[PDB]
């Protein structure tokens with residue numbers, strides 16, 4: 184309708200490929216634009232890795248307090264928290280926090296390693312119901328986002344359904360569900376993304392992503408002031424190889440689906 188047209192104008196203006204999936208928990212409504220098309224998650228995948236460790240802590244009490252050694256060799260392209268902890272230790276709750284709130288790649292690599300590799304992260308998604316999610320590489324290789332490459336991708340619909348189950352559903356235990364929500368609420372990297380296109384009185388819990396071919400992503404659990412929660416997934420990719428980041432598109436996409 185009006186929302187499908189408005190998003191198509193935005194996709195045309197941006198000169199790329201936009202994937203939008205919104206779920207309104209009040210009446211179970213959906214706004215779906217390229218919801219089945221495969222997009223490279225890049226850093227939005229970190230949620231699944233955090234949740235896999237969270238699901239693991241249900242059968243492993245005191246798991247999130249277990250210390251993990253941070254060495255100089257572990258350091259990759261972007262590690263804001265891990266670089267401050269070199270030749271020291273970080274707990275699994277701290278690595279989860281660093282990965283979700285500060286987008287630390289070394290922290291994400293430790294989460295992947297702890298569940299048994301990237302295939303075990305994909306194995307956890309099948310356990311929730313997600314048959315689209317796939318993690319084939321570790322950081323930093325998982326953010327290449329080459330057009331046509333199916334490695335490290337998911338569809339906006341599948342990620343929206345999965346985020347709904349993890350943050351609001353029964354995929355994780357009450358204690359674990361509360362922790363993921365708290366971490367995502369404490370995100371620092373999503374100010375100019377989805378949150379930028381929503382009013383200041385709305386409480387947002389999000390994860391952001393940035394990859395090759397101008398890939399700019401954001402997945403969010405939104406609490407509209409005084410109303411039932413929303414799940415929004417805004418995925419965006421560009422044709423040029425070193426195309427600059429366009430977080431404004433995600434803001435406009437969020438604005439179009441809510442306004």
Ligand SMILES: *C(=O)N1C[C@H](NOS(=O)(=O)O)CC[C@H]1C(=O)NO[C@H]1CCNC1
Nearest residue numbers: 225226260261286323326372391392393
């Ligand atoms: C995730 O996509 N990351 C990790 C960091 N994310 O922080 S962010 O949420 O603000 O975007 C930074 C961007 C991206 C990343 O690290 N990409 O590095 C890859 C891509 C090119 N080769 C390594």
